[PDB]
Design an enzyme around this catalytic site. Structure first.
Site, short mmCIF file in Angstrom:
data_model
loop_
_atom_site.label_atom_id
_atom_site.label_comp_id
_atom_site.label_asym_id
_atom_site.label_seq_id
_atom_site.Cartn_x
_atom_site.Cartn_y
_atom_site.Cartn_z
N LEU A 1 39.16 37.92 -64.78
CA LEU A 1 38.71 37.61 -63.43
C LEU A 1 39.97 37.17 -62.70
O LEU A 1 40.72 36.34 -63.22
CB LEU A 1 37.70 36.44 -63.44
CG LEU A 1 36.44 36.56 -62.57
CD1 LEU A 1 35.79 35.19 -62.43
CD2 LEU A 1 36.78 37.10 -61.20
N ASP A 2 40.22 37.73 -61.52
CA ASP A 2 41.42 37.37 -60.77
C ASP A 2 41.53 35.86 -60.50
O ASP A 2 40.53 35.15 -60.39
CB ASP A 2 41.48 38.14 -59.45
CG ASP A 2 41.70 39.63 -59.66
OD1 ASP A 2 42.28 39.99 -60.70
OD2 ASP A 2 41.31 40.43 -58.78
#
Ligand code: ZN
EC number: 5.4.99.25
Length: 300
Positions: free
Chosen positions: A38-39
């Site tokens: 997940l960024d």
RNA sequence: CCACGGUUCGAAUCCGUGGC
């Protein structure tokens, strides 16, 4: 020692590996990993695998995802999000109706190109690495599917909405793509992964704020993971045999559940213990051949 | 160990494959 999956919540800021370090420090174990990055600028559900749980993280790859995103029209950055250097910041004078048609024109399927800032590999190298060196790579497109979009909110240049997406889909690219369709560019400024498969943000746990006790009791045991895969139970006698080597044969089994050809199934036993994961060899339909071939076995 | 790949970007670090 606990073995299983942990539905974690990654606060906005830290990388997904940072969460792994936090959990591996809180539980005092190096065997920790996640099943989908997940960024950093984003937040939301992060599947975490603890100990033997890491061995099944690969089965969370092809799950669908639901995101809530807010994009800034007229803004384009190198990384496609608000943490990257700005490349262009113009005005976007388009009607709300145009914006909606543009957004919904993407519901269905389309060939999406992976953003330059991504973990994709090109020639033995990560794309974000090549990107930071100034080299921007355009990898061949992947046919992704946008199942549905809803909750569209328009507040000036900032537009937000929710999207259920197929595995491997980048919302970052989606925003840029919708911006391109509108002809004025768009960048994701906020991103929340609300669900990975059946796991929701509501169930997620912020490991950064939780104590070892809480994180440990939140771990879903192996026996309760991959709930959506057909199951099979063999005699408690066949246990240590499969739980060591060999394969799984027609007269070791005991219970049904229908599978497909090369479909994956969960192998339990009398005591409910999850012995292993086997890959079906033939469709389930009523004889001493390879019913299932062990593809993974857990020893505890 | 090496090579390749995976995953929504700062996984040497988690997973998988091939070779040793
Ligand atoms: Zn949040």
């Amino acid at each position: 020692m606990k073995h299983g999956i942990l539905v974690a919540y990654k606060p906005k800021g830290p990388t997904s590996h940072d969460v792994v370090d936090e959990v591996r420090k809180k539980l005092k174990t190096r065997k920790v990993g996640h099943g989908g990055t997940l960024d950093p600028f984003a937040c939301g559900v992060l599947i975490i695998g603890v100990n033997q749980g890491t061995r099944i993280l690969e089965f969370y790859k092809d799950l669908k995802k639901v995101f809530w995103v807010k994009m800034r029209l007229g803004l384009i950055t190198e990384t496609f999000d608000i943490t990257g250097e700005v490349v262009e910041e113009r005005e976007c004078n388009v009607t709300e109706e145009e914006i909606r048609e543009a957004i919904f024109s993407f519901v269905g399927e389309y060939d999406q190109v992976p953003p330059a800032y991504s973990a994709k590999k090109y020639k033995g190298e990560r794309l974000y690495k090549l990107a930071r060196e100034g080299k921007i790579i355009n990898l061949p497109p992947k046919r992704v599917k946008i199942f549905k979009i809803w909750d569209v909110n328009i507040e000036g240049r900032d537009v937000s909405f929710r999207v259920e997406v197929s595995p491997g889909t980048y919302i970052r690219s989606l925003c840029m793509d919708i911006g391109y369709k509108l002809g004025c560019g768009a960048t994701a400024v906020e991103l929340v992964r609300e669900s990975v498969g059946p796991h929701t943000i509501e169930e997620s746990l912020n490991v950064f704020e939780a104590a070892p006790e809480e994180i440990e009791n939140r771990i879903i045991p192996l026996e309760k993971c991959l709930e959506w895969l057909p199951r099979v139970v063999v005699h408690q006698e066949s246990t240590k045999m499969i739980l060591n080597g060999s394969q799984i044969h027609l007269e070791m089994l005991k219970e049904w559940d229908g599978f497909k050809k090369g479909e994956v199934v969960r192998v339990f036993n009398e005591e409910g213990r999850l012995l292993a994961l086997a890959e079906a060899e033939r469709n389930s339909s009523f004889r001493q051949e390879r019913v299932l071939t062990l593809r993974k076995v857990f020893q505890t």
